């Protein structure tokens, strides 16, 4: 059982656009109960992002059609579109639960006090995947996953504020996603704008704290913050 082969597998699977294989390899790496390098973290994130991403994209297409045919008033067709939506939801939720279990029982658990970058990165993932659950949940189940999403982002934001520079890509990326959560999930546009503007402004104030290694990644997330802000206003 060779950790380096599993990582190489993941790199191969990514190149061949086989994201299930990539997720499986990186899951297996995580299960070895040893910390992930930066490259390994991203390999895990990219893998599950695509696996869940294809279901999210399918669910939107299906929901969108469900709306139109629901209005059209043809049951037999409506039942089948709805059943298909449910089938995709179950897939999506299974992927989210899979990631969350890795996060809670391996990745967040094994972060030491000083591994701030990793804690924020993982807590942000935890917020993201509960947010993906929130996108498709209704009733009490929605309320629960929304609370969980909020608690993950909230904690990640505390750690980021205290221990990372305003221009740090991971901190910026969290502000980005957390603000999206505020707008789309909590329907709190004021809170969303405040977070995105603050994060953007704070990065700009300390713009000289950019290393050439982070310049490109930070400035690009900053554009996204601004893009969202322009849209929301």
């Amino acid at each position: 059982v060779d950790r380096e082969q599993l990582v190489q597998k993941a790199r191969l699977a990514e190149q061949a656009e086989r994201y299930d294989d990539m997720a499986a390899a990186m899951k297996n790496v995580t299960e070895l109960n040893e910390p992930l390098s930066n490259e390994e973290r991203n390999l895990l994130s990219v893998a599950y992002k695509n696996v869940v991403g294809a279901r999210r994209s399918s669910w939107r297409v299906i929901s969108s059609i469900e709306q139109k045919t629901s209005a059209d008033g043809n049951e037999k067709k409506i039942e089948m579109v709805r059943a298909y939506r449910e089938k995709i939801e179950k897939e999506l939720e299974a992927v989210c639960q899979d990631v969350l279990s890795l996060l809670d029982n391996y990745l967040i658990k094994n972060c030491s006090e000083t591994q701030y970058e990793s804690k924020v990165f993982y807590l942000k993932m935890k917020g993201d995947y509960y947010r993906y659950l929130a996108e498709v949940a209704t009733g009490e189940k929605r309320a629960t996953v929304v609370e969980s999403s909020e608690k993950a982002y909230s904690e990640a934001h505390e750690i980021s504020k205290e221990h990372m520079q305003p221009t740090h890509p991971i901190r910026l990326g969290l502000a980005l996603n957390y603000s999206v959560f505020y707008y789309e999930i909590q329907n709190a546009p004021e809170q969303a704008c405040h977070l995105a503007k603050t994060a953007f402004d704070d990065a700009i104030a300390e713009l000289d704290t950019l290393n050439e290694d982070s310049y490109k990644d930070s400035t690009l997330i900053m554009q996204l913050l601004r893009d969202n802000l322009t849209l929301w206003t």
Partner: peptide, 6 residues
């Protein structure tokens, strides 16, 4: 229509 981290 808001965009999250790619």
């Amino acid at each position: 229509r808001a965009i999250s981290l790619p």
